[PDB]
Design a protein around this nucleic acid. Structure first.
Lengths: 122, 14, 120, 62, 56
RNA sequence: AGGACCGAACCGACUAAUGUCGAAAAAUUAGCGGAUGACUUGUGGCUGGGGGUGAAAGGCCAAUCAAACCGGGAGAUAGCU
RNA sequence: GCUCGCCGGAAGACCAAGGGUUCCUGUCCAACGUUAAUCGGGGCAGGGUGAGUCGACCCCUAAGGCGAGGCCGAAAGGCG
RNA sequence: ACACAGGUGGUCAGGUAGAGAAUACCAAGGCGCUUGAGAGAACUCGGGUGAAGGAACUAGGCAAAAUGGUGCCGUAACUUC
RNA sequence: AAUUCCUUGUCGGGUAAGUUCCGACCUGCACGAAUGGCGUAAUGAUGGCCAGGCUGUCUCCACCCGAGACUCAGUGAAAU
RNA sequence: GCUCAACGGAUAAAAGGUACUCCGGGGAUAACAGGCUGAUACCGCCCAAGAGUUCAUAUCGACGGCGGUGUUUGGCACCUCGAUGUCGGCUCAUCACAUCCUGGGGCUGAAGUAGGUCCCAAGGGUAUGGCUGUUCGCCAUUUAAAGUGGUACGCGAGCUGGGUUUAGAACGUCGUGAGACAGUUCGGUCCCUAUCUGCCGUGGGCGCUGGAGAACUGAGGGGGGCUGCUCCUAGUACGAGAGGACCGGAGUGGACGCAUCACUGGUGUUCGGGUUGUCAUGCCAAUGGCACUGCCCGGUAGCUAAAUGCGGAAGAGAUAAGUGCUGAAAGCAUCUAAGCACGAAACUUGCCCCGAGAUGAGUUCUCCCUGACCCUUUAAGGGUCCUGAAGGAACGUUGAAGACGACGACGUUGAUAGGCCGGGUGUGUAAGCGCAGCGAUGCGUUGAGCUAACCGGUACUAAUGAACCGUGAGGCUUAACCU
């Protein structure tokens, strides 16, 4: 469950550390995001060696939730921290070349192939 | 009665 | 909307409710018949019957669990020695309710609650 | 209606008659007083003064 | 809260038309003594279903 | 030593709620500021109405104050309802 | 009478100020107590308040009042 | 004006834990505060908890939530030191 | 600026986005040196803003515990 | 002898502030609003120079004019000063189309997409944050869209009080001064227990006529009607290339509404366990009371969503805009004058709900009542005895039904409620005993003990036999039918 004004950790090594979700993209009057939905974020903290600076407003994708994602068997997968992967605003194509932490199987559809290809687990 | 109070402080409308 | 709930509130908090159920169950054990309102007797049916159910079998620990309720030594002394071997054959339902008019103080439904006893 | 203070009349009826130019994109504001048509006259005089100032400034720079 | 005008005697009577109390009119007869009592209630002397249930 | 600090009695009412034909014509609840000094309080006196008093609001002067209450001019006056 | 619960730097016990018998006993409840009322700080009757050692009375005094004569002021009176 | 959640000066004043007249439970003592019995609807008050975000709510971190005690280490700008 | 109408005057910072705030620019309608000016340690139930923690404030409310509200017995108003 | 110039001259002789104000009043007279008009405002139309490679009319359009609305400011004071609470915000909305999107079409200066303009269509939807008290405006990011207005610029006997106008204080300006400033800024008590209409629900009496138990048909009324993205068609048509279809089908999303705890959670002060301070059971152990449920940790059943499904339709009839066929008036032409076939989320159905109080009171099935008499204003009359029939009502056990009524199950020919047995779940190795250790404590019996609202059984207790209401077959007229 990622909604507005939510602080998230950055999953890949693009450079940012803390980001703030400012709007859940996709559909008007939407409360919160889901498994692999696109959100709009701003950057609150970044490293000096990052490819993006502090204050860049860009699109990202949620990969790990504390609310949990639901497999259709009846199980739930809850992570101990929210996480997102940054995307370049017209073609997604993520900035980070190495991604820390596992991802969920429902992210694999035709556009997040690079994220699950760089994913170390699941 | 003995004491009749001051009425309620009304709406301004000034 | 209390769908499938039990337990009467009786316009009291749980401390006073448990304390008066303790004292009223002790009075019903000691006197073998008392006169109260009707829903208090209806809920005391859910209090005295587990006490007699615990008093079915005499041992060391059952005396301590029957002393954890009713907070009195004379009540647990009348238990396990007099009520125990006398209610041995009957299995459950040891109480009896008798509706007796209304109280003249507040018009409340009155009831004698007693045990199946007094053939002495 | 406008911003400002002190009257029952102050809230109900408008007094901000902002003039916004199309070819230059300048708005004149004389949320000024009492009523909106003297504020229209004030906001048109400010439009004329700012046009004269912005043209004579370009001429003194030309 | 504050009324415009007072209601009538007719309005008060039509309001109190449903305030009429209902009597039970279903007094029973005991099997042994035959004293008058209500349904599922003991008598003044403690009779119920013929048996002396109060023992007092 | 401190017109020192935190914090009870005590003094006052800064926020929100309950009331607002209220438990009460200013209150209570949960937090507050001071609390060894320009503090608080009991008792008994003094200052009084074009005056008294005021770390000053034109506040208070017996629940009434930019001129208290009581009695008398007075059944004032009123082109007003 | 049996237990449950509350305060316990008080919601305990003595007084000062202030009330004026509200103290106790017997009897009764028409009026009062925001419900019954055989209960009472409610009605009726009776009893109860014992000081050389407690406090008041008495000596003196602060703030302050009155104030012989005395000063001032139409009078009333003001100061002392 | 009431058998009123208000105010009223002085004295005695214990046990455990506690720095303490705070606070928690008790002794000596008085009380259960002169309407009760049911049911546990919407709504109102005092509260308790809550997945995920943590002020995005609002004029305003208003209200709530959070810190909170003893011993030790260490404590910046500035300064009237 | 507690000052300022034009005005949300202009630049930079803070936020993704800031008519509030800070440091300035002086074009001071209409600041100003005891009806005192500029700074100033400490202090303030002082005005405003930001940062961390914290949370039902909100997203979006949900349940539970007592006091009312509902019914019965008794007493029983008020504004109009 | 008076510019007693306020000049039929109140004194020979007189300026100001009140937001500290106070009284008698007024809608004779203003602010907020309602009323009349529409100068102004918005929108529509007539003429036409001209802009547009030509070309007024694809889209605009000067100079001029005519109209609609009461949405802006205006004008008059018709109603209100023995009181109509106003701005903005939160919740709750309703209506019109001069339509923001979706839908159906015409022209185009429309190759396709994306467009410009115009008509019909109100069925549905119609933002999130910063600033400002602000409606509004700008910024950032979405969306298919971020519609205009009315309803006392909707809504304070629904809520604040940020701003504005009670009392305090200040800055700048004016005034000798008191004071004033629609020039800011600091802070400042917003009452009411619902008599009537209305609305949300829920009941009693009576009616439909002999009564009752059910089952429905159905008048009429109500709820909903939003659509994105991806893929196939299809890179197809079109297009030099880039780009890129219409129509049709399928899947997955956001919001809305409904349903339910099967999964995941929250609550679960009635279940279990840990622990602190004190007290009690004569003491250890163990347990209980208080301190916000003491602090917490979980957690049964119910409630609830963040959890899971469902739906907006498909189809039919009649159509608006529009496209047409045949076809005269008017030998041609012509969608219309006669007629016919198409044509939208607009209308009625079709999806669902309430509903015969629809006093027009409906239809079907079934059950039950077939006993004598007097008085007589022989009236659809009144009275007495005997019987109480089907059924209903009262009481009790009670409910995933419920404020109270009402509804459902049961009442001994019983599983309706309570109790008991077993299982399940939850907390988690109870107490006692034995062993190790100076001790706290640890281990075995034991994954035990306790279990609320759960399930399957069990009459162990409580729902007693009875009494109450409701009746003797049911009005007049006419026709068809068996006698």
């Amino acid at each position: 469950m990622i909604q507005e004004q939510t602080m998230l950790n950055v999953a890949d090594n693009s450079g940012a550390r803390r980001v703030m979700c400012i709007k859940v993209l996709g559909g008007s009057h939407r409360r919160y995001a889901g498994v692999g939905d696109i959100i709009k974020i701003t950057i609150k903290e970044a490293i000096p060696r990052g490819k993006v600076k502090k204050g860049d407003v860009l699109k990202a994708v949620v990969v790990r939730t504390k609310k949990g994602v639901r497999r259709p068997d009846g199980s739930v997968i809850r992570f101990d921290g929210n996480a997102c992967v940054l995307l370049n605003n017209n073609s997604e194509q993520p900035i980070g070349t190495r991604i820390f932490g596992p991802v969920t199987r429902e992210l694999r559809s035709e556009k997040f192939m690079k994220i699950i290809s760089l994913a170390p687990e699941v | 009665p003995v004491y009749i109070p001051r009425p309620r402080p009304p709406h301004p409308r000034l | 909307m209390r769908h499938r709930k039990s337990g009467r509130q009786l316009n009291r908090n749980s401390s006073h409710r448990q304390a008066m159920f303790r004292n009223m169950a002790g009075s019903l054990v000691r006197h073998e018949i008392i006169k109260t309102t009707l829903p208090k007797a209806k809920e005391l049916r859910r209090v005295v019957e587990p006490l007699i159910t615990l008093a079915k079998t005499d041992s060391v620990a059952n005396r301590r669990l029957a002393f954890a309720r009713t907070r009195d030594n004379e009540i647990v002394a009348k238990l396990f020695n007099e009520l125990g071997p006398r209610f041995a054959s009957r299995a459950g339902g040891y109480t009896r309710i008798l509706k007796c008019g209304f109280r003249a103080g507040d018009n409340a439904p009155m009831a004698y609650i007693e045990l199946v006893d007094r053939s002495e | 209606r406008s911003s400002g203070a002190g009257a029952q009349h102050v809230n109900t009826t408008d007094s901000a008659i902002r003039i916004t130019h199309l070819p230059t994109g300048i708005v004149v504001e004389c949320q000024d007083e009492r009523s909106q048509h003297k504020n229209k006259a004030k906001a048109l005089s400010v439009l004329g003064a700012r046009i004269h100032a912005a043209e004579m400034a370009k001429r003194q720079q030309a | 809260a504050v009324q415009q005008n007072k209601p009538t005697r007719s309005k008060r009577g039509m309001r109190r038309s449903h305030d009429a109390l209902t009597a039970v009119t279903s007094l029973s007869v005991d099997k042994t003594s035959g004293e008058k009592h209500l349904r599922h209630h003991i008598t003044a002397d403690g009779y119920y279903r013929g048996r002396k249930v109060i023992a007092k």
